[PDB]
CSV table of C-alpha atoms in Angstrom, one decimal:
chain,number,residue,atom,x,y,z
A,918,UNK,CA,60.8,115.0,95.2
A,919,UNK,CA,57.5,114.2,96.7
A,920,UNK,CA,54.4,111.9,96.2
A,921,UNK,CA,51.5,113.2,96.2
A,922,UNK,CA,48.0,113.4,94.8
A,923,UNK,CA,47.8,114.9,91.2
A,924,UNK,CA,45.1,117.1,89.8
A,925,UNK,CA,43.8,115.5,86.2
A,926,UNK,CA,45.1,118.2,84.4
A,927,UNK,CA,48.5,117.5,85.5
A,928,UNK,CA,48.2,113.6,85.2
A,929,UNK,CA,46.7,113.5,81.6
A,930,UNK,CA,49.3,115.9,80.2
A,931,UNK,CA,52.3,113.8,81.8
A,932,UNK,CA,50.9,110.6,80.7
A,933,UNK,CA,50.3,111.6,77.4
A,934,UNK,CA,54.4,112.5,77.1
A,935,UNK,CA,55.4,109.3,78.2
A,936,UNK,CA,56.4,106.3,76.3
A,937,UNK,CA,54.5,102.9,77.9
A,938,UNK,CA,51.9,105.1,79.3
A,939,UNK,CA,48.9,102.6,79.1
A,940,UNK,CA,45.5,103.6,77.6
A,941,UNK,CA,44.2,103.2,81.4
A,942,UNK,CA,46.5,105.5,82.5
A,943,UNK,CA,44.2,108.6,81.1
A,944,UNK,CA,41.9,111.1,81.8
A,945,UNK,CA,39.1,109.7,80.3
A,946,UNK,CA,39.7,106.0,81.8
A,947,UNK,CA,39.8,108.3,85.0
A,948,UNK,CA,36.6,109.7,84.5
A,949,UNK,CA,34.8,106.8,83.5
A,950,UNK,CA,36.0,104.4,86.8
A,951,UNK,CA,34.9,107.2,88.6
A,952,UNK,CA,31.3,107.2,86.6
A,953,UNK,CA,31.1,103.6,87.7
A,954,UNK,CA,31.7,104.6,91.7
A,955,UNK,CA,35.0,103.2,91.8
A,956,UNK,CA,37.1,104.9,94.5
A,957,UNK,CA,39.7,106.5,92.5
A,958,UNK,CA,42.8,108.2,92.9
A,959,UNK,CA,45.5,110.0,91.2
A,960,UNK,CA,48.8,110.1,92.3
A,961,UNK,CA,52.1,110.5,91.4
A,962,UNK,CA,56.1,112.7,92.1
A,963,UNK,CA,56.6,115.7,91.6
A,964,UNK,CA,60.3,117.2,91.1
A,965,UNK,CA,61.4,120.8,93.1
A,966,UNK,CA,60.0,122.5,90.0
A,967,UNK,CA,56.4,121.3,90.5
A,968,UNK,CA,57.3,118.9,87.5
A,969,UNK,CA,55.6,116.0,87.5
A,970,UNK,CA,58.1,113.0,87.3
A,971,UNK,CA,55.9,109.9,87.8
A,972,UNK,CA,52.3,109.0,87.9
A,973,UNK,CA,49.3,106.4,88.3
A,974,UNK,CA,45.7,105.8,88.2
A,975,UNK,CA,44.6,103.8,91.5
A,976,UNK,CA,41.5,102.0,91.8
A,977,UNK,CA,40.1,100.5,95.2
A,978,UNK,CA,37.4,98.2,96.1
A,979,UNK,CA,36.4,97.0,99.5
A,980,UNK,CA,37.5,93.7,100.5
A,981,UNK,CA,37.0,92.0,103.7
A,982,UNK,CA,34.6,94.5,105.3
A,983,UNK,CA,36.3,97.4,106.2
A,984,UNK,CA,39.5,97.1,104.0
A,985,UNK,CA,40.0,97.9,100.0
A,986,UNK,CA,42.2,96.1,97.7
A,987,UNK,CA,44.2,98.5,95.3
A,988,UNK,CA,44.9,97.9,91.9
A,989,UNK,CA,47.6,100.2,89.3
A,990,UNK,CA,45.5,99.8,86.0
A,991,UNK,CA,49.0,99.1,84.2
A,992,UNK,CA,50.7,101.9,86.0
A,993,UNK,CA,52.5,103.3,86.9
A,994,UNK,CA,53.8,105.7,84.2
A,995,UNK,CA,57.5,106.9,85.0
A,996,UNK,CA,61.0,106.6,84.0
A,997,UNK,CA,61.9,102.9,84.5
A,998,UNK,CA,65.8,103.5,84.0
A,999,UNK,CA,65.7,105.3,87.1
A,1000,UNK,CA,65.9,102.8,89.4
A,1001,UNK,CA,65.8,105.2,92.4
A,1002,UNK,CA,62.8,106.8,91.3
A,1003,UNK,CA,61.5,103.5,90.8
A,1004,UNK,CA,62.3,102.5,94.0
A,1005,UNK,CA,61.1,105.5,95.6
A,1006,UNK,CA,58.1,105.6,93.9
A,1007,UNK,CA,56.8,101.8,95.2
A,1008,UNK,CA,58.3,102.5,98.6
A,1009,UNK,CA,56.0,105.8,98.9
A,1010,UNK,CA,52.9,104.0,97.1
A,1011,UNK,CA,53.0,101.1,99.7
A,1012,UNK,CA,52.9,104.2,102.7
A,1013,UNK,CA,49.9,106.0,100.5
A,1014,UNK,CA,47.9,103.1,100.5
A,1015,UNK,CA,48.7,102.2,104.3
A,1016,UNK,CA,46.8,105.6,104.9
A,1017,UNK,CA,43.7,104.1,102.9
A,1018,UNK,CA,43.1,100.5,105.0
A,1019,UNK,CA,44.8,98.4,101.9
A,1020,UNK,CA,44.6,94.9,102.2
A,1021,UNK,CA,46.6,94.1,99.2
A,1022,UNK,CA,48.4,96.4,96.6
A,1023,UNK,CA,48.3,94.6,92.6
A,1024,UNK,CA,50.3,96.3,90.2
A,1025,UNK,CA,50.6,95.2,86.4
A,1026,UNK,CA,53.3,97.5,85.3
A,1027,UNK,CA,53.4,98.3,81.2
A,1028,UNK,CA,57.3,97.2,81.4
A,1029,UNK,CA,58.9,95.0,79.0
A,1030,UNK,CA,60.2,91.8,80.1
A,1031,UNK,CA,61.3,90.3,76.8
A,1032,UNK,CA,61.2,90.0,72.8
A,1033,UNK,CA,60.2,87.4,71.0
A,1034,UNK,CA,59.0,86.2,67.5
A,1035,UNK,CA,55.2,84.8,66.4
A,1036,UNK,CA,56.9,81.5,66.3
A,1037,UNK,CA,57.5,81.8,70.1
A,1038,UNK,CA,60.9,82.5,70.2
A,1039,UNK,CA,62.9,84.5,72.3
A,1040,UNK,CA,64.7,87.2,70.4
A,1041,UNK,CA,65.4,89.5,73.3
A,1042,UNK,CA,65.8,90.6,76.8
A,1043,UNK,CA,64.2,94.0,77.3
A,1044,UNK,CA,66.7,94.9,80.2
A,1045,UNK,CA,64.6,95.3,83.1
A,1046,UNK,CA,65.1,92.0,84.6
A,1047,UNK,CA,66.7,93.8,88.3
A,1048,UNK,CA,63.1,95.3,88.2
A,1049,UNK,CA,61.6,91.9,89.6
A,1050,UNK,CA,64.5,91.9,92.4
A,1051,UNK,CA,63.8,95.4,93.7
A,1052,UNK,CA,59.9,94.7,93.5
A,1053,UNK,CA,60.9,90.9,96.3
A,1054,UNK,CA,63.0,93.6,98.3
A,1055,UNK,CA,59.9,95.7,98.6
A,1056,UNK,CA,57.5,92.6,99.3
A,1057,UNK,CA,56.1,92.8,95.5
A,1058,UNK,CA,55.5,89.6,95.4
A,1059,UNK,CA,55.5,88.3,91.4
A,1060,UNK,CA,52.2,85.9,90.4
A,1061,UNK,CA,54.2,84.0,87.9
A,1062,UNK,CA,55.1,83.7,84.6
A,1063,UNK,CA,51.5,83.0,83.3
A,1064,UNK,CA,50.2,82.5,80.0
A,1065,UNK,CA,46.7,82.4,78.4
A,1066,UNK,CA,43.7,84.8,79.1
A,1067,UNK,CA,43.3,84.8,83.0
A,1068,UNK,CA,40.0,86.3,84.1
A,1069,UNK,CA,41.4,89.0,86.1
A,1070,UNK,CA,45.1,89.4,85.0
A,1071,UNK,CA,46.2,91.4,82.2
A,1072,UNK,CA,47.4,89.3,79.3
A,1073,UNK,CA,51.5,89.2,79.2
A,1074,UNK,CA,51.9,89.6,76.1
A,1075,UNK,CA,51.2,91.7,72.8
A,1076,UNK,CA,52.0,91.4,69.3
A,1077,UNK,CA,53.2,95.4,68.4
A,1078,UNK,CA,54.4,96.7,64.8
A,1079,UNK,CA,57.2,99.2,65.0
A,1080,UNK,CA,55.9,102.5,62.8
A,1081,UNK,CA,58.7,104.3,63.5
A,1082,UNK,CA,60.5,105.8,60.6
A,1083,UNK,CA,58.2,103.8,58.1
A,1084,UNK,CA,56.1,104.9,55.4
A,1085,UNK,CA,53.0,103.2,54.1
A,1086,UNK,CA,55.0,101.6,51.3
A,1087,UNK,CA,57.6,100.4,54.0
A,1088,UNK,CA,54.7,98.8,55.8
A,1089,UNK,CA,53.3,96.7,52.9
A,1090,UNK,CA,56.5,96.1,51.8
A,1091,UNK,CA,57.3,94.2,55.0
A,1092,UNK,CA,53.8,92.2,55.1
A,1093,UNK,CA,54.7,88.4,54.3
A,1094,UNK,CA,52.4,87.6,50.4
A,1095,UNK,CA,49.1,86.6,52.3
A,1096,UNK,CA,48.7,90.1,54.2
A,1097,UNK,CA,50.4,92.3,51.3
A,1098,UNK,CA,47.9,90.5,48.7
A,1099,UNK,CA,44.4,91.1,50.8
A,1100,UNK,CA,45.5,94.2,51.7
A,1101,UNK,CA,46.1,95.6,48.3
A,1102,UNK,CA,42.4,93.7,47.4
A,1103,UNK,CA,40.4,96.1,50.0
A,1104,UNK,CA,42.4,99.2,48.6
A,1105,UNK,CA,40.2,98.5,45.0
A,1106,UNK,CA,37.0,95.7,45.9
A,1107,UNK,CA,34.7,98.5,47.1
A,1108,UNK,CA,35.1,98.2,50.4
A,1109,UNK,CA,35.0,101.1,52.1
A,1110,UNK,CA,35.3,102.2,56.3
A,1111,UNK,CA,33.5,104.5,58.5
A,1112,UNK,CA,33.5,105.1,61.7
A,1113,UNK,CA,30.7,104.2,64.5
A,1114,UNK,CA,28.9,106.6,67.1
A,1115,UNK,CA,27.4,104.8,69.7
A,1116,UNK,CA,23.8,104.4,68.1
A,1117,UNK,CA,25.5,102.4,65.9
A,1118,UNK,CA,27.1,100.4,68.3
A,1119,UNK,CA,25.1,97.8,67.7
A,1120,UNK,CA,26.5,96.9,64.4
A,1121,UNK,CA,29.9,96.5,66.0
A,1122,UNK,CA,28.4,94.2,68.7
A,1123,UNK,CA,27.1,92.2,65.9
A,1124,UNK,CA,30.5,91.2,65.1
A,1125,UNK,CA,31.2,90.3,68.5
A,1126,UNK,CA,30.2,93.2,79.0
A,1127,UNK,CA,27.6,95.4,76.6
A,1128,UNK,CA,28.0,98.6,78.8
A,1129,UNK,CA,32.0,98.0,78.7
A,1130,UNK,CA,31.8,99.5,75.0
A,1131,UNK,CA,29.0,101.9,75.6
A,1132,UNK,CA,30.9,103.5,78.2
A,1133,UNK,CA,34.2,103.5,76.6
A,1134,UNK,CA,32.9,105.6,73.4
A,1135,UNK,CA,31.4,107.7,75.8
A,1136,UNK,CA,34.3,108.3,78.7
A,1137,UNK,CA,37.2,108.0,76.2
A,1138,UNK,CA,35.9,110.6,72.9
A,1139,UNK,CA,38.5,110.9,70.7
A,1140,UNK,CA,40.4,108.3,72.1
A,1141,UNK,CA,38.3,105.6,70.7
A,1142,UNK,CA,37.1,105.1,67.4
A,1143,UNK,CA,34.7,101.9,65.9
A,1144,UNK,CA,35.7,101.8,62.2
A,1145,UNK,CA,33.5,99.4,60.4
A,1146,UNK,CA,34.3,98.1,56.9
A,1147,UNK,CA,31.6,97.6,54.3
A,1148,UNK,CA,30.0,97.9,51.1
A,1149,UNK,CA,26.9,100.3,50.3
A,1150,UNK,CA,25.8,98.1,47.1
A,1151,UNK,CA,24.4,101.2,44.9
A,1152,UNK,CA,27.7,102.8,45.3
A,1153,UNK,CA,29.3,99.9,44.4
A,1154,UNK,CA,26.9,98.6,41.5
A,1155,UNK,CA,27.6,102.3,40.5
A,1156,UNK,CA,31.2,101.7,40.6
A,1157,UNK,CA,30.7,98.9,38.7
A,1158,UNK,CA,28.8,99.6,35.3
A,1159,UNK,CA,31.0,102.7,35.1
A,1160,UNK,CA,34.0,100.2,35.1
A,1161,UNK,CA,31.6,98.4,32.5
A,1162,UNK,CA,31.0,101.5,30.0
A,1163,UNK,CA,34.6,101.4,29.5
A,1164,UNK,CA,35.4,97.8,29.0
A,1165,UNK,CA,32.5,98.1,26.4
A,1166,UNK,CA,33.9,101.2,24.4
A,1167,UNK,CA,37.2,98.9,24.6
A,1168,UNK,CA,35.8,96.0,23.6
A,1169,UNK,CA,34.3,98.0,20.8
A,1170,UNK,CA,37.6,99.5,19.5
A,1171,UNK,CA,38.5,95.7,19.8
A,1172,UNK,CA,36.0,94.5,16.9
A,1173,UNK,CA,37.1,97.3,15.1
A,1174,UNK,CA,40.5,96.1,14.9
A,1175,UNK,CA,39.7,92.9,14.2
A,1176,UNK,CA,37.4,93.9,11.1
A,1177,UNK,CA,40.1,96.4,9.4
A,1178,UNK,CA,42.6,93.2,10.3
A,1179,UNK,CA,40.9,89.7,10.3
A,1180,UNK,CA,44.3,88.0,10.5
A,1181,UNK,CA,46.0,90.2,13.4
A,1182,UNK,CA,46.1,87.6,16.4
A,1183,UNK,CA,46.9,90.4,19.0
A,1184,UNK,CA,44.0,91.8,17.9
A,1185,UNK,CA,41.8,88.5,18.9
A,1186,UNK,CA,43.9,87.7,21.9
A,1187,UNK,CA,42.6,91.5,23.2
A,1188,UNK,CA,38.8,90.9,22.3
A,1189,UNK,CA,39.0,87.4,24.1
A,1190,UNK,CA,40.5,89.4,27.6
A,1191,UNK,CA,38.4,92.2,27.4
A,1192,UNK,CA,35.0,89.4,26.7
A,1193,UNK,CA,36.6,87.7,30.0
A,1194,UNK,CA,36.5,91.0,32.2
A,1195,UNK,CA,33.3,91.9,30.7
A,1196,UNK,CA,31.9,88.1,32.4
A,1197,UNK,CA,33.5,89.0,35.3
A,1198,UNK,CA,32.3,92.4,36.3
A,1199,UNK,CA,28.8,91.2,35.4
A,1200,UNK,CA,28.7,88.3,37.8
A,1201,UNK,CA,29.9,91.0,40.3
A,1202,UNK,CA,26.8,93.4,39.4
A,1203,UNK,CA,24.8,90.2,39.6
A,1204,UNK,CA,26.4,89.2,43.0
A,1205,UNK,CA,25.6,92.7,44.4
A,1206,UNK,CA,22.3,93.0,43.3
A,1207,UNK,CA,21.5,89.5,44.9
A,1208,UNK,CA,23.3,90.5,48.2
A,1209,UNK,CA,21.5,93.8,48.4
A,1210,UNK,CA,18.2,92.9,48.1
A,1211,UNK,CA,19.2,89.7,50.5
A,1212,UNK,CA,20.9,92.5,53.3
A,1213,UNK,CA,19.5,95.3,52.4
A,1214,UNK,CA,22.3,98.4,50.8
A,1215,UNK,CA,24.7,98.7,53.1
A,1216,UNK,CA,26.5,95.2,54.3
A,1217,UNK,CA,29.1,95.2,57.3
A,1218,UNK,CA,31.7,93.0,57.0
A,1219,UNK,CA,34.2,93.6,59.7
A,1220,UNK,CA,34.9,95.6,62.7
A,1221,UNK,CA,36.9,96.7,65.2
A,1222,UNK,CA,37.4,99.3,68.5
A,1223,UNK,CA,40.4,101.0,68.8
A,1224,UNK,CA,42.0,103.2,71.9
A,1225,UNK,CA,44.1,106.1,70.1
A,1226,UNK,CA,46.5,107.8,72.1
A,1227,UNK,CA,49.8,109.7,71.9
A,1228,UNK,CA,52.1,106.1,72.4
A,1229,UNK,CA,50.2,103.8,70.7
A,1230,UNK,CA,47.1,102.6,68.5
A,1231,UNK,CA,45.6,99.7,70.0
A,1232,UNK,CA,43.3,97.0,68.7
A,1233,UNK,CA,41.5,95.9,71.4
A,1234,UNK,CA,38.6,94.0,70.2
A,1235,UNK,CA,37.7,92.8,67.0
A,1236,UNK,CA,35.5,90.6,64.1
A,1237,UNK,CA,34.9,89.9,61.1
A,1238,UNK,CA,31.7,88.3,59.2
A,1239,UNK,CA,32.9,84.8,58.5
A,1240,UNK,CA,30.5,84.3,55.1
A,1241,UNK,CA,32.2,87.8,53.5
A,1242,UNK,CA,35.6,87.3,54.4
A,1243,UNK,CA,36.1,87.0,50.8
A,1244,UNK,CA,35.3,91.0,50.8
A,1245,UNK,CA,38.7,90.8,53.4
A,1246,UNK,CA,37.1,93.5,55.5
A,1247,UNK,CA,39.4,92.6,58.1
A,1248,UNK,CA,42.5,93.5,55.9
A,1249,UNK,CA,40.0,96.9,55.3
A,1250,UNK,CA,40.1,97.5,58.8
A,1251,UNK,CA,43.9,97.0,60.4
A,1252,UNK,CA,45.2,99.0,57.2
A,1253,UNK,CA,42.6,101.7,57.8
A,1254,UNK,CA,43.7,102.2,61.9
A,1255,UNK,CA,47.4,101.6,60.6
A,1256,UNK,CA,47.5,104.8,58.5
A,1257,UNK,CA,45.2,106.6,61.0
A,1258,UNK,CA,48.7,106.0,63.4
A,1259,UNK,CA,51.4,106.8,60.4
A,1260,UNK,CA,49.7,110.0,59.1
A,1261,UNK,CA,48.9,111.3,63.0
A,1262,UNK,CA,52.4,110.4,64.5
A,1263,UNK,CA,52.2,108.0,66.8
A,1264,UNK,CA,55.3,105.4,66.1
A,1265,UNK,CA,53.3,102.0,67.5
A,1266,UNK,CA,50.6,100.1,66.3
A,1267,UNK,CA,49.1,97.3,69.0
A,1268,UNK,CA,47.5,94.2,67.6
A,1269,UNK,CA,47.6,93.6,71.2
A,1270,UNK,CA,46.8,90.7,73.5
A,1271,UNK,CA,48.1,87.1,72.7
A,1272,UNK,CA,48.2,83.9,74.6
A,1273,UNK,CA,51.9,83.4,74.7
A,1274,UNK,CA,51.1,79.7,74.3
A,1275,UNK,CA,52.9,79.5,70.3
A,1276,UNK,CA,52.0,76.1,69.3
A,1277,UNK,CA,49.9,74.7,66.6
A,1278,UNK,CA,46.8,73.7,68.6
A,1279,UNK,CA,46.9,77.0,70.8
A,1280,UNK,CA,43.2,79.0,71.2
A,1281,UNK,CA,44.6,81.7,69.4
A,1282,UNK,CA,46.5,80.2,66.6
A,1283,UNK,CA,44.7,81.7,63.8
A,1284,UNK,CA,45.2,84.6,65.1
A,1285,UNK,CA,48.7,84.7,65.7
A,1286,UNK,CA,49.8,83.9,62.3
A,1287,UNK,CA,47.6,86.4,61.1
A,1288,UNK,CA,49.2,89.1,63.6
A,1289,UNK,CA,52.7,87.5,61.9
A,1290,UNK,CA,51.9,88.8,58.6
A,1291,UNK,CA,52.4,92.1,59.2
A,1292,UNK,CA,55.7,92.0,60.9
A,1293,UNK,CA,54.5,92.5,63.9
A,1294,UNK,CA,56.8,91.4,66.7
A,1295,UNK,CA,56.1,89.8,70.1
A,1296,UNK,CA,56.4,91.9,73.7
A,1297,UNK,CA,56.1,89.9,76.6
A,1298,UNK,CA,56.0,92.0,79.9
A,1299,UNK,CA,56.9,91.4,83.6
A,1300,UNK,CA,53.6,90.5,84.7
A,1301,UNK,CA,51.7,90.9,88.1
A,1302,UNK,CA,52.7,91.7,91.7
A,1303,UNK,CA,51.1,91.3,94.7
A,1304,UNK,CA,52.4,93.8,98.2
A,1305,UNK,CA,50.0,92.1,101.2
A,1306,UNK,CA,49.2,94.7,103.3
A,1307,UNK,CA,47.7,92.9,106.1
A,1308,UNK,CA,49.4,89.1,105.9
A,1309,UNK,CA,47.1,87.4,108.1
A,1310,UNK,CA,43.7,89.2,107.2
A,1311,UNK,CA,45.1,88.4,103.7
A,1312,UNK,CA,45.5,84.8,104.0
A,1313,UNK,CA,42.1,84.5,105.2
A,1314,UNK,CA,40.7,86.3,102.0
A,1315,UNK,CA,42.8,84.0,99.6
A,1316,UNK,CA,41.0,80.9,101.6
A,1317,UNK,CA,38.0,81.8,100.4
């Protein structure tokens, strides 16, 4: 067991095989930070067999002239059940950053603390409480149980949907009435989903820095997807006309029947049933033509920015057009990615950040109800810890 630097290959291979390895603990994020000019380090622990048993991507930024602010980027990735290994890692990380003029070390481990429901009630303890005391003993001072979206600190609460041993039918069955209904709706209402490339990134942007997204696409490569729910009017209108032909054919059968049995009430009811569908079909066609002329043949209605890694699919950011919410593009986008995870062996679907303030007046109250409807649960993480390396200088730094 030795603390050491890791090659990108070793780093990526290890983090891909571990639970709770954040999308920031990847080779793509490593290359991204390097590209953006950050001092970047890949550290970890190897055992006797030269096997990686812990890793962490660290970034450093100059502060107070000659020092550096070190950040663990949601890492380290390590077996947190092994308290001795955890102790060794954080002690050696401290020694490591002291070799690089660190002023203070900031860590925000992707480590569960508590589980809650979307009403803000604690449903269980993750069993990692010992972590707080150990970090304290090592000089890593916890910043507190913060809530809401901070400018610097990562959000401490995620809405997460467990997919382990579940099929798409199980997922739909566990949705609440509103989500199930809307999900069934998009499955058959003319909405389609495609994945946007860099040149169409502005379409996604229309629903929401700018370079933030571009760089993720470029460096994360296949670990990022940008689904766009949309309507292609020519294809939509074509489908409606094909459905109309069928209705017309059935209607005529109905009319013949009423002739051969002018008293058959069922036949009369059947004709009325079909005529009503024809009128609805006609209005749909007229609406399609009107929207097509005003907006063009492709109407984008919802989009999302997703990170994809072996541990989970993350719904990072997204938006939906207020004017076309009735098309349920939002549900189409979510359904596409939940299915992506189910079809390709990823057992966790992360709706990601929620404020943690489960009140009706909460800034994200509407979003939380939406996530709640998918049968997701809330995971509260331990939070942030800071270990000042040069206390007086750090004191001056904070005073600024």
